[PDB]
Structures are given as structure tokens and as C-alpha cells.
Design an enzyme around this catalytic site. Sequence first.
Site, PDB file in Angstrom:
ATOM      1  N   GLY A   1     -33.144 -45.441 -32.761  1.00  0.00           N
ATOM      2  CA  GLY A   1     -34.396 -46.157 -32.910  1.00  0.00           C
ATOM      3  C   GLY A   1     -34.787 -46.441 -34.343  1.00  0.00           C
TER       4      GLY A   1
ATOM      5  N   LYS B   1     -46.129 -36.848 -32.266  1.00  0.00           N
ATOM      6  CA  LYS B   1     -46.241 -37.764 -31.146  1.00  0.00           C
ATOM      7  C   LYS B   1     -45.024 -37.440 -30.284  1.00  0.00           C
ATOM      8  CE  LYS B   1     -44.430 -41.353 -34.244  1.00  0.00           C
ATOM      9  NZ  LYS B   1     -44.703 -42.710 -34.754  1.00  0.00           N
ATOM     10  N   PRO B   2     -45.071 -37.800 -29.003  1.00  0.00           N
ATOM     11  CA  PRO B   2     -43.991 -37.543 -28.055  1.00  0.00           C
ATOM     12  C   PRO B   2     -42.609 -37.972 -28.533  1.00  0.00           C
ATOM     13  CG  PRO B   2     -45.972 -38.194 -26.896  1.00  0.00           C
ATOM     14  CD  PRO B   2     -46.202 -38.500 -28.349  1.00  0.00           C
TER      15      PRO B   2
ATOM     16  N   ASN C   1     -41.438 -37.848 -31.505  1.00  0.00           N
ATOM     17  CA  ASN C   1     -40.851 -36.927 -32.481  1.00  0.00           C
ATOM     18  C   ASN C   1     -40.759 -35.471 -32.026  1.00  0.00           C
ATOM     19  OD1 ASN C   1     -43.441 -35.927 -33.446  1.00  0.00           O
ATOM     20  ND2 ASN C   1     -43.551 -37.786 -34.689  1.00  0.00           N
TER      21      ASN C   1
ATOM     22  N   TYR D   1     -39.512 -44.480 -41.630  1.00  0.00           N
ATOM     23  CA  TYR D   1     -39.168 -44.920 -42.987  1.00  0.00           C
ATOM     24  C   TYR D   1     -37.931 -45.815 -42.929  1.00  0.00           C
ATOM     25  CZ  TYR D   1     -42.027 -40.822 -44.369  1.00  0.00           C
ATOM     26  OH  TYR D   1     -43.021 -39.881 -44.531  1.00  0.00           O
ATOM     27  N   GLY D   2     -37.109 -45.594 -41.910  1.00  0.00           N
ATOM     28  CA  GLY D   2     -35.894 -46.368 -41.770  1.00  0.00           C
ATOM     29  C   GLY D   2     -35.358 -46.368 -40.357  1.00  0.00           C
TER      30      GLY D   2
ATOM     31  N   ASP E   1     -47.644 -36.390 -38.400  1.00  0.00           N
ATOM     32  CA  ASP E   1     -47.461 -37.468 -37.437  1.00  0.00           C
ATOM     33  C   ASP E   1     -46.814 -37.050 -36.127  1.00  0.00           C
ATOM     34  OD1 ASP E   1     -47.759 -40.160 -36.567  1.00  0.00           O
ATOM     35  OD2 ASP E   1     -45.773 -40.693 -37.339  1.00  0.00           O
TER      36      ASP E   1
ATOM     37  N   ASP F   1     -38.868 -35.249 -37.451  1.00  0.00           N
ATOM     38  CA  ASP F   1     -39.435 -36.316 -38.284  1.00  0.00           C
ATOM     39  C   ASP F   1     -40.757 -35.966 -38.968  1.00  0.00           C
ATOM     40  OD1 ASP F   1     -40.063 -39.901 -37.890  1.00  0.00           O
ATOM     41  OD2 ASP F   1     -38.912 -38.849 -39.384  1.00  0.00           O
TER      42      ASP F   1
HETATM   43  C1  LIG Z   1     -34.630 -38.636 -37.683  1.00  0.00           C
HETATM   44  C2  LIG Z   1     -35.664 -38.757 -36.556  1.00  0.00           C
HETATM   45  C3  LIG Z   1     -36.679 -39.737 -36.626  1.00  0.00           C
HETATM   46  C4  LIG Z   1     -37.640 -39.875 -35.606  1.00  0.00           C
HETATM   47  C5  LIG Z   1     -37.631 -39.035 -34.471  1.00  0.00           C
HETATM   48  C6  LIG Z   1     -36.620 -38.039 -34.371  1.00  0.00           C
HETATM   49  C7  LIG Z   1     -35.647 -37.911 -35.409  1.00  0.00           C
HETATM   50  C8  LIG Z   1     -34.614 -36.846 -35.223  1.00  0.00           C
HETATM   51  O1  LIG Z   1     -34.479 -35.905 -36.026  1.00  0.00           O
HETATM   52  C9  LIG Z   1     -33.744 -36.912 -33.997  1.00  0.00           C
HETATM   53  S1  LIG Z   1     -33.730 -38.039 -32.808  1.00  0.00           S
HETATM   54  C10 LIG Z   1     -32.542 -37.284 -31.925  1.00  0.00           C
HETATM   55  N1  LIG Z   1     -31.961 -37.636 -30.712  1.00  0.00           N
HETATM   56  C11 LIG Z   1     -32.535 -38.407 -29.686  1.00  0.00           C
HETATM   57  C12 LIG Z   1     -31.692 -38.590 -28.574  1.00  0.00           C
HETATM   58  C13 LIG Z   1     -32.170 -39.324 -27.503  1.00  0.00           C
HETATM   59  C14 LIG Z   1     -33.466 -39.853 -27.576  1.00  0.00           C
HETATM   60  S2  LIG Z   1     -34.040 -40.745 -26.199  1.00  0.00           S
HETATM   61  N2  LIG Z   1     -35.021 -41.929 -26.616  1.00  0.00           N
HETATM   62  O2  LIG Z   1     -35.085 -39.903 -25.630  1.00  0.00           O
HETATM   63  O3  LIG Z   1     -33.019 -41.572 -25.570  1.00  0.00           O
HETATM   64  C15 LIG Z   1     -34.306 -39.682 -28.685  1.00  0.00           C
HETATM   65  C16 LIG Z   1     -33.839 -38.942 -29.772  1.00  0.00           C
HETATM   66  N3  LIG Z   1     -32.080 -36.128 -32.511  1.00  0.00           N
HETATM   67  C17 LIG Z   1     -32.784 -35.887 -33.759  1.00  0.00           C
HETATM   68  N4  LIG Z   1     -32.554 -34.788 -34.585  1.00  0.00           N
END
Ligand SMILES: Cc1ccccc1C(=O)c1sc(Nc2ccc(S(N)(=O)=O)cc2)nc1N
Length: 288
Positions: A11, A125-126, A128, A15-16, A123, A141
Amino acid sequence: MENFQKVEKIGEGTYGVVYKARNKLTGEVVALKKIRTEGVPSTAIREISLLKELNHPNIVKLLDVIHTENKLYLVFEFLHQDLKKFMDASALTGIPLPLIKSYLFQLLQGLAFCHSHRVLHRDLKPQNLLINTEGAIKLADFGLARRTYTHEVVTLWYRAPEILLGCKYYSTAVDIWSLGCIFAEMVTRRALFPGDSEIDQLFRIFRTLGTPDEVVWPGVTSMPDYKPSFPKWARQDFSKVVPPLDEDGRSLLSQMLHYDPNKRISAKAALAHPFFQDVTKPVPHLRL
Ligand SMILES: Cc1ccccc1C(=O)c1sc(Nc2ccc(S(N)(=O)=O)cc2)nc1N
């Protein structure tokens, strides 16, 4: 990254961009956040260093920080699903109370830890909050004191009222407020305060909890963005807010949503609330 094989985009962070990637050498699977740049900060560097040492079971582990070619990469341990997706997947039936309670309890432990180390998330939220198949939930995050970029829309639904009112210095209380909004959402399966603008967010909070005044929030009328012209709404009966949450849960939520940041319950104190007398750690049903 030359050392990273992008598997897929997770996603657009804050920030990026965020990617699921594999360390082409170690084979380790990670989440990679790519940021921007024309100089890069130094005050942030210190913040990143502390976050990197900030290791706890309910905090996503920051593995590496790589600044190269006017780009900043943050490498995190990978989790398979975020709470936003899990809530949407559970909207028909609702997340079982024991799991809601377990998640709230773990997030409070995570916050109690960062807060005792003087670290604020800012910040929550669901999207993060990340979960795994073992029943754990972790904070991800973290936002620095210092949306991705163009073509985006920042979610204000979990923003504390003091931030909306122009407070210049956030306190750990802002995270408790956001988590209270998330707790309510897991329970009712509807966002508590779904504002589409800062003023709509503020007024949705006022319509539910009552327009704040000097009696419940000393100093509120002297805040930067406060206007005497704000409409005056009466507080709504709290039992109408999160039915059918039990009284222990409603009591804890009311304390997490106190207008006055100084009256708002701390993460540490919330961990001792009667609502957690029967807390357990159930296994969620995750479709990956
Ligand atoms: C760097 C960052 C920015 C914003 C939010 C989280 C992170 C983060 O550290 C994340 S995100 C993730 N996996 C994941 C896998 C599947 C799904 S999902 N939509 O539920 O398919 C969502 C996240 N793993 C980590 N460590």
C-alpha cells in the site's frame, strides 16, 4: 533495493510506499517502506535510532534503516494482515469479545511500553495495527514529530480532539484516544467518529460526547483553534454509543475518551481496569 525482490505492493504508507519483499540473500520476508528528498533531517535520525531499539512483543520490529540515493528505506518484520482487513472480513459476524479484549490488552501493553520510553505513536488506526496467526497484534508505522504524498486522503477518524483544536505539543494521551476509537469500532463494527474534514471530525466528536467546556476540559476555550461560535451539543447517553458492550467495557472506553488529556486514562492504568479481569489470548481465524 538491489538486495530486495519486491513481491507485491502492500500500500501507500504515510511517507512513501510499502512493499512485501524478500531479502535476495537471506531469503527473509519483510515489509519495506520507501520514502522520498533534498537534504534529509538529523532530528529524525535520532528518532529512528530509538525506534530501532524500541523492541517489544506488541511493536513491529524495525530491522534496518537504509539511507541511500536520496531515498530512505525502513525494513520491518513482516506480518500477514492488518486490523482494517480483519475487521472488514469479520463485519458480518463481529470479532468475538474475547479477541477484541485480547487485542486491546496487547495494544495497551505496547503503548505502556513506548510511552514509558517517551515514544508516542501519533497516528494509530486499524491499517497500522498488524496481526498474525498466533493471536498477537502489533503497533506499526509510528509517526515522527518531524499521507504518502500527492493524490491521497488522510484519515482523521482516530484523531484526538486536542490535535484538532490546534494543540502544539501532543502528549501520550493522543494514542489512548485513537485506541479508544478503535476499540469502539471493533465492538460496533462501525467507525465511531467518521469525519471527512477536520471540522466535521471535531463536530462529530462534539455531537456524541457533548461540546467541551471549561467544566470538563479546563483551558479548552483558550486553545488555538477553539471558537466561541462552535455549536453547543449536549452529551449523548453513553449506552447508545457502543451497544451492546458491557459496563466494564463502557467504563474503560469512557476513560479513554475523556476530553481533558490530563484526565484521560494512561495505558498503564487501563491495563489494570476491571474489564481485563478475564482476559485471555484466543486464536483468530485468519484467511491469508
Ligand atoms: C511500513 C508500514 C506502513 C504502514 C502500515 C504498516 C507498515 C508495516 O510495518 C507492515 S505492513 C505489513 N504487512 C501487511 C500484510 C497484509 C496486509 S492486508 N491489507 O491486510 O492485506 C497489510 C499489511 N507488515 C508490516 N511490518
